[PDB]
């Protein structure tokens, strides 16, 4: 399939990844740069994020979804459902609103595209209506991450896809902080793109630290596989 092959060819190997985020949460201004590589053949990503403005004013875990769906492993039997690679190299806009229960919300707009051999994820994030002493600005979340599937649906009107999913961030008392995700993606380019039938991506995420790193940071190892059309 010559259409589907174009975007596929870009992901057959290990691809360098650049992430840039510019953020403001309740007037806490911060920037994060991230680097690593992704191997979509295996749905694998390896990333390290640095807060370049000092201390991250929010928990790392809350930014994990915001910090690369083109790196999912879509099985062969599902290749006609891979919107994300089909939009490449011209890329796609990923937009979200993320509602933290009993707290504030994040609004994000990201451009995911190739710049030569590097896959770039450029993000702006605005956070509003957060409680200073809430779980987010008060840093009350565990430094870990639960496995979640995420349900991709076609969004014909936007030449694109939508996603809604809920993340549960474990708290230091057995409580969970919910983060209700609404997401839309649309091509940057004008060309044909795949419009999938409903399916989902399964995510597993592990967070760690680098002993040699003195800046505030997050090491992220992720695996992501498409499923749900049998």
Curated annotation (Swiss-Prot):
Photocytes. Green fluorescent protein has been engineered to produce a vast number of variously colored mutants, fusion proteins, and biosensors. Further generation of mutants led to more stable proteins (at 37 degrees Celsius for example) with brighter fluorescence and longer fluorescence lifetimes. GO terms for biological process: bioluminescence; generation of precursor metabolites and energy. Changing residue 175 to G: In GFPA; leads to enhanced fluorescence at 37 degrees Celsius. In Venus; leads to yellow fluorescence, improved maturation and reduced environmental sensitivity. It holds the Pfam family GFP. Changing residue 33 to R: In mut1.28; shifts fluorescence lifetime from 3.03 to 2.76 ns. In mut2.2; shifts fluorescence lifetime from 3.03 to 1.94 ns. In mut3.3; shifts fluorescence lifetime from 3.03 to 1.88 ns. Keywords: Chromophore, Luminescence, Photoprotein. Contains a chromophore consisting of modified amino acid residues. Maturation of the chromophore requires nothing other than molecular oxygen. It comes from the Eukaryota. Belongs to the GFP family. This is Green fluorescent protein. It comes from Aequorea victoria. The gene is GFP.
């Amino acid at each position: 399939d010559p259409m589907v092959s174009k975007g596929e060819e870009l992901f057959t190997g290990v691809v360098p990844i650049l992430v840039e985020l510019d953020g403001d949460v309740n007037g806490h201004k911060f920037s994060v740069s991230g680097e690593g590589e992704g191997d979509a053949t295996y749905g694998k990503l390896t990333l390290k994020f640095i807060c370049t403005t000092g201390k991250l004013p929010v928990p790392w875990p809350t930014l994990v979804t915001t910090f690369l769906m083109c790196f999912a492993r879509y099985p062969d039997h599902m290749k006609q459902h891979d919107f994300f690679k089909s939009a490449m190299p011209e890329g796609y806009v990923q937009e979200r609103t993320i509602f933290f229960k009993d707290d504030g919300n994040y609004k994000t707009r990201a451009e995911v595209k190739f710049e030569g051999d590097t896959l770039v994820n450029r993000i702006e994030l605005k956070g509003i209506d957060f409680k200073e002493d809430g779980n987010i600005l008060g840093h009350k979340l565990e430094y870990n991450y639960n496995s979640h599937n995420v349900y991709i649906m076609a969004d014909k009107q936007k030449n694109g896809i939508k996603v809604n999913f809920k993340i549960r961030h474990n708290i230091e008392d057995g409580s969970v902080q919910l983060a209700d995700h609404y997401q839309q993606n649309t091509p940057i380019g004008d060309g044909p793109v795949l419009l999938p039938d409903n399916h989902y991506l399964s995510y597993q995420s592990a967070l760690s630290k680098d002993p040699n790193e003195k800046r505030d940071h997050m090491v992220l190892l992720e695996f992501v596989t498409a499923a749900g059309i049998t």
